[PDB]
Design a protein around this ligand. Structure first.
Ligand SMILES: N#Cc1c(F)cccc1NCCc1ccccn1
Ligand SMILES: N#Cc1c(F)cccc1NCCc1ccccn1
Ligand SMILES: N#Cc1c(F)cccc1NCCc1ccccn1
Lengths: 281, 281, 281
């Protein structure tokens, strides 16, 4: 199924009938970082498998729902169970849910992820406001927009200079200052490692030379689809570890250690993003 | 359809019957840079859609013709409507038209493109003679030659050391000196960004570190197919902007600004390439 | 055919019945470096085409056998005719033979390849013990593990920090010292160029900046599948040429020159690896 205007419209039609919610904010949460979705008020849970033209996700399994409702007086739509390109989903399968968000009315997309730290200033448990990216799949002919252009959503050749909204970064930092956790909050450049292997120690060292501050396996495909169709983005990484220090000390990593860091910061991130949603212009 | 010997031959058979032209020069022109094709003498226009085994191009639409005739006393064949890998064409679809050129008799291929400037010496409106390249798709398992080798055209493992002919670069510079526009003409290394998004500001900064002078979304796939089968290449970029200056000043870009630069230099480029064709050994 | 548990088991069943050999060492040899396979004792030769669920290799042609038997008192299984991703094989086709090795009992995989030298200390005819890698296809969304995870073999997110066993590197160097050819043996970082074109002179210069010591078109896909499923690896490159010196002097390369270097070192490499096999703990 192509992520075109007709097919995105059929999915939006079904959602509108079932939920009665008209959202203007969308959220996509990282692994272990989705507790906010369980606190949406007057919520409606829609399994992907029920929605016309949504991508098939039964080979990977696990949760896959769209959740609509209210947070802080604001109408939102959330993806519960994010789609990652290392699972083998096509460009069209990744893009269709973001384009349905656009047709539903979404004007701002908030995204979190887990990432490895490259910059020597970053420690486990820190947050990084993403201000730009290095897209190795895009340079290498695996950009999420390779294929015919869907003209109703955006232009053939997008400019990504302003993909990460500066005012949303400033609001996020302001709220961290108000609650006295600004000492945890950095800004930086995100490198997209297609995955699913963690980057190797020699790859981490290369990324340090090339000006990257953090590395992860998500987020950039969704940012590009959002920017193409005029949706503003805030993206925040939670740092699991410092890859460069771990290479110097020959320390390993595994998904369990990553999820332990997510549990340690889950409740603070939930409170932060509730306030960002409440305060969005 | 595979870009093999049998299928390229069937296309060449059809073309030979309809045109009666035996070309020894091929040309592929960048966007907004194709006016020379409309001045080919005693010309024959063949829609791709009419030619056996040519790739299907109706999803993208717009012009798609092969044009044969004479320039400066020389027999040429032109692609009007270039095929780009960011549109989703396969390796086989890109390679088949170049291999038909080879079977028709082409010994020299001339190519222009629009590109972003990285080297601090480059300004909007400058020309760069391409002397080498950095092929991010090729390093990343999206090289145009991935697949079985077509032995009748070339070897399994090509050497690209001499893909950009030195004597053709010297002729191009000589003719610019004769007409007193050598102040516009540089040489440099071309980075292939698969596209279709312009490279991000942090990607431009990375490319400066890695020794790239210009960046674009075309040309390298065709150069590799030509080099594989023994066709000599001259490739020239027209610089739309300096990506590094625009990042320092937070200036945006869009396809309209690119095409305005092409219109500004179209007539000079047409005159330059007519003389290069006339003067080729 | 997916490289899953059921399909790998059917292939292992067939092999077990025909060979009666239970191997605990696997070997994959580079081009022109396979003479050891012809000296396996009490050997059994099984054409890939006869084995259930093995990948189809008739478009490329040439030899394709699994060979089982004894070396130095140890039970081994060899791939005669390696599968390379530049030929167009899928992730699933590359992974299935390594996963059959795992089900047969393989605990250690030994690999050789031919490679270009980047580090200024490397000369034609030198050996490099691989201690880490830079995987441009993996960064760029062409990692061999993209797709659903096969949980019976390994985890969704592997750590490659220890993919190249340190004790096996130390054994290999010890045996070179015993036979007084340690002056030929270096260690270094391997860059994976997807291929099939040799990397360009400007790509070689980029790789020098990024900390790479050698460059080649194989090995990293097999290493990742082995590490995922708990098989220890030793990988050794034979250096064909120094790419940086050849760029400074405008010297070309071709597959014939590569194979001449392999013939020059074939007999020494055969003797080295026989002793490594004999001495493995
Ligand atoms: N890519 C990525 C990534 C990620 F997506 C989430 C968390 C950490 C990541 N890299 C860590 C690299 C590393 C490898 C081995 C030991 C220590 N560190
Ligand atoms: N890739 C490519 C490219 C091209 F193919 C043609 C013309 C310009 C290109 N990059 C410009 C990068 C850039 C982004 C945002 C603002 C200014 N500059
Ligand atoms: N990639 C790779 C590679 C290889 F797989 C085996 C042997 C040599 C390799 N590069 C040599 C680069 C080069 C290009 C032109 C002239 C001299 N040198």
């Amino acid at each position: 199924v192509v992520a075109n205007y007709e097919n995105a419209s059929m999915a939006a039609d079904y959602i509108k009938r079932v939920s009665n919610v008209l959202p203007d904010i969308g959220i996509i949460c990282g692994s272990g970082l989705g507790k906010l979705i369980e606190e949406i008020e007057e919520r409606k849970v829609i399994p992907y498998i029920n929605i016309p033209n949504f991508p098939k996700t039964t080979v990977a399994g696990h949760v896959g729902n769209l959740v609509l409702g209210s947070v802080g007086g604001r109408k939102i739509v959330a993806m519960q169970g994010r789609l990652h390109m290392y699972e083998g989903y096509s460009n069209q399968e990744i893009a269709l849910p973001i384009r349905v968000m656009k047709l539903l009315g979404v004007r701002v997309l908030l995204i979190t992820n887990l990432a490895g730290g490259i910059n020597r200033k970053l420690k486990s448990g820190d947050f990084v406001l993403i201000k730009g990216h290095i897209n190795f799949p895009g340079l290498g002919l695996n950009n999420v927009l390779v294929g015919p252009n869907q003209d109703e959503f955006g232009p053939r050749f997008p400019d990504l200079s302003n993909a990460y909204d500066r005012l949303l970064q400033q609001l996020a930092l302001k709220i961290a200052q108000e609650n006295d956790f600004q000492d945890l909050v950095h800004e930086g450049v995100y490198a997209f490692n297609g995955g699913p292997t963690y980057e190797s120690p020699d790859e981490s060292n290369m990324l340090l030379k090339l000006g990257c501050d953090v590395v992860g396996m998500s987020t950039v495909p969704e940012v590009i689809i959002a920017c193409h169709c005029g949706i503003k983005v805030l993206a925040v990484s939670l740092i699991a570890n410092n890859s460069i220090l771990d290479a110097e000390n020959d320390v390993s990593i595994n998904h369990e250690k990553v999820l332990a860091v997510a549990e340690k910061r889950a409740d603070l991130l939930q409170m932060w993003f509730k306030e960002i949603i409440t305060r969005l212009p």
